Amino acid sequence: ATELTVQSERAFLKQPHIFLNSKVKVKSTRPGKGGRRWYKDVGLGFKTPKTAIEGHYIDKKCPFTGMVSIRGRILTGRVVSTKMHRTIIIRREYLHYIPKYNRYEKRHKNLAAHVSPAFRVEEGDMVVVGQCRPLSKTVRFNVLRVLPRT
Amino acid sequence: GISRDSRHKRSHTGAKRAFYRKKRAFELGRQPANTRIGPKRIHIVRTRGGNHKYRALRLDSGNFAWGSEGCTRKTRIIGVVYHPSNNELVRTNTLTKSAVVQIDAAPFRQWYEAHYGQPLGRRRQQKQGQVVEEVKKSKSVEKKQAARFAAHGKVDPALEKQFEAGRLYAIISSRPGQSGRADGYILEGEELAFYQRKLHK
Amino acid sequence: ARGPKKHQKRLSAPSHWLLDKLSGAYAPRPSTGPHKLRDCMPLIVFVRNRLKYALNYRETKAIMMQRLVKVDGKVRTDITYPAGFMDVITIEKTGENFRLIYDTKGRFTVHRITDEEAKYKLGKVKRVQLGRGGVPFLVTHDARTIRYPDPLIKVNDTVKIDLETGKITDFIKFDTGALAMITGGRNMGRVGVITHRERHDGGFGIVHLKDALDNTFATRESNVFVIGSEKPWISLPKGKGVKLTIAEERDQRRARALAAA
RNA sequence: AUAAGGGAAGUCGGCAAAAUAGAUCCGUAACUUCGGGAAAAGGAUUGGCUCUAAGGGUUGGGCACGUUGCGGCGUGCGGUUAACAACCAACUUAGAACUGGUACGGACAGGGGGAAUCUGACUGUCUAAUUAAAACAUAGCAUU
RNA sequence: UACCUGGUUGAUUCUGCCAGUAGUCAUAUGCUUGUCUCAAAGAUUAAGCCAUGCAUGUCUAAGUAUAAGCAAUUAUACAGCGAAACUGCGAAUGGCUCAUUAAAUCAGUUAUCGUUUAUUUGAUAGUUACAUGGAUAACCGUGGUAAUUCUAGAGCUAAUACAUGCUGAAAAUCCCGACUUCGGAAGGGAUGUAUUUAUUAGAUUAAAAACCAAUGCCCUUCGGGGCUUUCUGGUGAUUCAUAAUAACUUCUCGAAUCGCACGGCCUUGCGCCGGCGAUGGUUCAUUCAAAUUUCUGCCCUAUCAACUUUCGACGGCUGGGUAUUGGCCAGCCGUGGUGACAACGGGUAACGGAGGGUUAGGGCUCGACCCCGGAGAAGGAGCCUGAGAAACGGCUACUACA
RNA sequence: ACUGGCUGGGCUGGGCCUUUCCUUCUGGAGAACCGCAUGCCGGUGUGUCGGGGAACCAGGACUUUUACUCUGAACAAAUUAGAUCGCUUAAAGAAGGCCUAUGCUUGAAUACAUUAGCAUGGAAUAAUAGAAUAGGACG
RNA sequence: GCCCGUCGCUACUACCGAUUGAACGGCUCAGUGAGGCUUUCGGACUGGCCCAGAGAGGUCGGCAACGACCACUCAGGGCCGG
Ligand SMILES: [Mg+2]
Ligand SMILES: [Mg+2]
Ligand SMILES: [Mg+2]
Ligand SMILES: [Mg+2]
Ligand SMILES: [Mg+2]
Ligand SMILES: [Mg+2]
Ligand SMILES: [Mg+2]
Ligand SMILES: [Mg+2]
Ligand SMILES: [Mg+2]
Ligand SMILES: [Mg+2]
Ligand SMILES: [Mg+2]
Ligand SMILES: [Mg+2]
Ligand SMILES: [Mg+2]
Ligand SMILES: [Mg+2]
Ligand SMILES: [Mg+2]
Ligand SMILES: [Mg+2]
Ligand SMILES: [Mg+2]
Ligand SMILES: [Mg+2]
Ligand SMILES: [Mg+2]
Ligand SMILES: [Mg+2]
Ligand SMILES: [Mg+2]
Ligand SMILES: [Mg+2]
Ligand SMILES: [Mg+2]
Ligand SMILES: [Mg+2]
Ligand SMILES: [Mg+2]
Ligand SMILES: [Mg+2]
Ligand SMILES: [Mg+2]
Ligand SMILES: [Mg+2]
Ligand SMILES: [Mg+2]
Ligand SMILES: [Mg+2]
Ligand SMILES: [Mg+2]
Ligand SMILES: [Mg+2]
Ligand SMILES: [Mg+2]
Ligand SMILES: [Mg+2]
What we know:
The structure is cut from a larger assembly and holds chains A (about 150 residues), B (about 200 residues) and C (about 260 residues). With about 150 residues, chain A is mainly beta. Chain A is built from 1 helix and 5 strands; from the N terminus they run αβββββ. Chain A is elongated. The two termini of chain A are about 20 Å apart. Chain B has about 200 residues and is of the alpha+beta class. Chain B has a 5-stranded mixed beta barrel with strand order 4-5-6-7-8. Chain B has a 3-stranded mixed beta sheet with strand order 1-3-2. Chain B starts with about 35 loop residues before the first strand and ends with a helix. Chain C is about 10% helix and about 30% strand. In chain C, a hairpin with a 4-residue loop joins strand 5 and strand 6. The radius of gyration of chain C is 20 Å and the shape is globular. The chains are: A mainly beta (about 150), B alpha+beta (about 200), C alpha+beta (about 260). Chain B: GO terms for molecular function: structural constituent of ribosome. Chain B: It comes from Chaetomium thermophilum (strain DSM 1495 / CBS 144.50 / IMI 039719).
């Protein structure tokens, strides 16, 4: 994503329980132990994006550098709206079977998901989302990977 | 009474839902308690499952911890100076989580004097009003204390200016309405500079 | 519905209890205990409906008040006590011991056992970790918690319990080539040898077994209960859980009938 | 100028008088030449005091040499301050707490409204000194 | 059992409907009625109104007995049964009905690394004491009101009711240090658990060196050749399980309870030790669960085509509140969200499902009703106790009946 | 019941060479083919032998993506179809049976649901992606 | 032969229609507003102490030197609770 500055708000944004002002300086390989940026891996064969490790953004809803765990269903779709702030709308299409007439018809549903600043999402793209805990009135999924363009 | 269910809301398509059932024993809410600085006053409340919570109506002291060394001493809170949510909270001087306050620095200065045998933030030398010396009863203490000073280091210039006046900025990190305690830490460094930069302009 | 339930309607009881649809409207409604409600063996149903020792409810509840019957070496006095897999029930006055195990048709059956072998059990482990104070412990499928176990023991394994001192004498690893009996699903009563296991990341793995008669079947890991590597430690009931199909079942039924008379 | 209770029972006839009235925010029918009707009808708020937030102007930005007595220049050649620093200036709008004999467009200033019929389309004009109207004129139409 | 017949014309062949025919665990009604096995039944119109009676209480050897209670006569503290009463538990399960309700309930399938949990079951907690203190019921005796499961004041006594309260161990860790020869040391304090905040550890999983700073050492010929090295669990995934440090708290828990057995020691004191049960008790695990939650699936109607954000409608942030997440709520900042693949609205003589009726196959129609889930107790709201209720055979208020 | 067959005819399936045949590394135990000497009636234990790993197991990486179909898993009692037993037959029921027993023995099955969700094999039919300003593949 | 329409009589069904027609029900602006949870003062009534000490009396031991304790009345002050 494109963010001009990291601290542009009323309060001060910082990762919880990450001590940042220590008199003695110690260099450690562990992400959160030494006092530098903390991050984790979700799993299910999903690789942490490179921009996350060195980025400066603060987000408490990103599966990476956040306090949200991913568990439940994993779904895929096409983005139809991405013009609001840090949230996108995807469109899913399927086929319903009518038993009497022995043929199908198309149907669709709309879904809301939270998008992290690590990814860059444009209109008409394939995304893969995973279930999470309720984050808002109608947001229960998080994007994990953006498939390459045709 | 107060309810926190989503039935009375409006669906994401804009449709209006219909009446389903009367209010339930769960999904209840309670009147907020506005903590203020004053003589201590706390009420007990019997919550779900037979447990209890503690409503704090007036508080005057709580634990605050100094970061780098790691010592925490109990002292009193003078007043609230900033609140990211609402200014009226500041003017009424009511304190909640993430409230910037001013705290007495005396216990921490005394502990610093005991741990390191040097004075911190003393510009009263112009007055020479309270100069006093007590003979220190040892010689191993200078090598141990000077070892601490030569190893740990020295305090940044910003914090002594705060110590001369005797007031320190802190942030409440507890929930006074829930736990009945006001706790926090002394804030310093670049996060401190953020607050002084925002506080007076 | 304004609290927990305390009545159970007949025609809703578990099928493997084999309760007649007539002669009453209610069922024993087993009390809370160490075993799951869905698959348990109430003491009143076992004593009255299978052994036929007690004619009806009134003296059925009298029997436990005399402290005649005990399970796992400890006397139980409640009529609706949930018994389960592998538990040992001992009646000293008549002088025999029983073990509850599924038959090949998916229901509990009476099974005499000898006294010397009727003084130990074995159960699958559910979780292992260290508790308060740093003391390691594990809990099995029958709500047995044991502290200071062998550190090599992991989850999904099975452990032999003395039942008098609760000490870990021996254990069986969970790997290919072991002998297992199924405890849940439609495959009730089968016994097989682990052939190979395939795992799915994200939960709900499946395991493939192979019977002695070259039959093949699969089941979830939550339903497999390993009882040995070779020469299973416990004594299997008659038929060994082989699940003959109906064609030979009728052939053997007539063959046995003509052989006897 | 004011009047208890009733509120047009007075009278040819509500003649005279009373009631409504500023500003801000909601709400607004039949009908229609689609421009109106409409300020339709009908509701709420309004003082004093102590605060918070928003709406502007002016002057400053790198090296490399040469005249003129640290400076105006003459030039050549880079970067767009993740917009900073100082000073100056009137008013208009929104929000919060406390306060009072529940009062606050406190004097002045300041629309009564609705359902229908007859008649002239409208704005306009005339009997100065008893009649301002349905009378006259008007645009449009038609004829010689 | 994959089936048809009568009716337009003077007569004929067609489209086409009217009529006939059969079933119904589908209701009403007429005439008639001997026996055997089984037995539905004020749902439809009025979720309209009710006289009367009943439908929820409970004691063991083991909480409290001075019954002017009975019964015996081993118990001069009692000792059997046991009215009344305090205390504990249950009364939130059952039973009835279908008024409301059109993505709501519900069904199959997921999640809780987002919560509460009586009880049952299994483990688990070393900082005056040979026994602490005031009330109260039952009871005696005296009253008020036409009236109720209404109650006053006076005199007594109990707890598993209420309120207090006792380092019996060592070791280890962290701070202050009286006192020197400067290289360690006398002795002083803290240290269970619950609650709240900050900080630290919670390792990796291929190998070979050479320098600076400077110190446990073995051998030793004093030139030194040198130096191998002890632990760390789990998940697909975390700030997980768990440990340590500095402090905090109108603040918890760590047993002043009860019944059977009659035993063993020598310094023989009314000395010490010793079994099995009941009732309780902190945390973890389990069981019965409960509350939220992912995906897909509901009748007719366009003479319903645009809807939602006054006073939350879509999203971001800081908090409050709740058992917890969440526009559930309070402030600040963006302008979004659904729709012809039928949104939004109006009808329903609409509780949903498992399922009933009728058959070549495909279908049409019904489902108040014994099984599962949801809701209600004349209509609305509010609440105490309790683990659990927005309860009505619980209370408060209004309207209508009485 | 039933054995060889028949150079029988079909049918299903599994291995190689045809320009194609079938991804890859680590570790486990270990076969087949080989000889070494020690012992019997041209084969073998032999082992504390190694040249050697058919197949198998566990772990990691790579593999266009949907629809479709086959086989599994998970899913309620009642109901429907349906097996057994002469309640004197039957609608029902889940019972009962055996010489004579102070005893023994069995059953209380099975299939379907079908929409959505989870795995496995097949690769026709119907869609989708890829090297053209090379921004392509390999060492 | 079949057959079309106005007008007159009788019977039935629906439609337009002055009357700001009438009755019943649902959702809503505004005004008035019972009850209750939470909260701020209040303290009917109650309990516990500590001192100083009025006034009197007793107790057990001490020759004594001295200790300790228990009953009455008026209390003085407090100074903390529910
Ligand atoms: Mg019920
Ligand atoms: Mg999982
Ligand atoms: Mg008047
Ligand atoms: Mg008047
Ligand atoms: Mg009037
Ligand atoms: Mg008159
Ligand atoms: Mg008149
Ligand atoms: Mg007038
Ligand atoms: Mg008006
Ligand atoms: Mg008008
Ligand atoms: Mg005002
Ligand atoms: Mg006015
Ligand atoms: Mg005119
Ligand atoms: Mg005139
Ligand atoms: Mg005039
Ligand atoms: Mg004219
Ligand atoms: Mg004819
Ligand atoms: Mg009815
Ligand atoms: Mg009624
Ligand atoms: Mg007794
Ligand atoms: Mg109905
Ligand atoms: Mg317990
Ligand atoms: Mg108690
Ligand atoms: Mg939040
Ligand atoms: Mg759109
Ligand atoms: Mg209805
Ligand atoms: Mg029904
Ligand atoms: Mg209810
Ligand atoms: Mg109620
Ligand atoms: Mg009743
Ligand atoms: Mg009831
Ligand atoms: Mg039959
Ligand atoms: Mg109102
Ligand atoms: Mg009020």
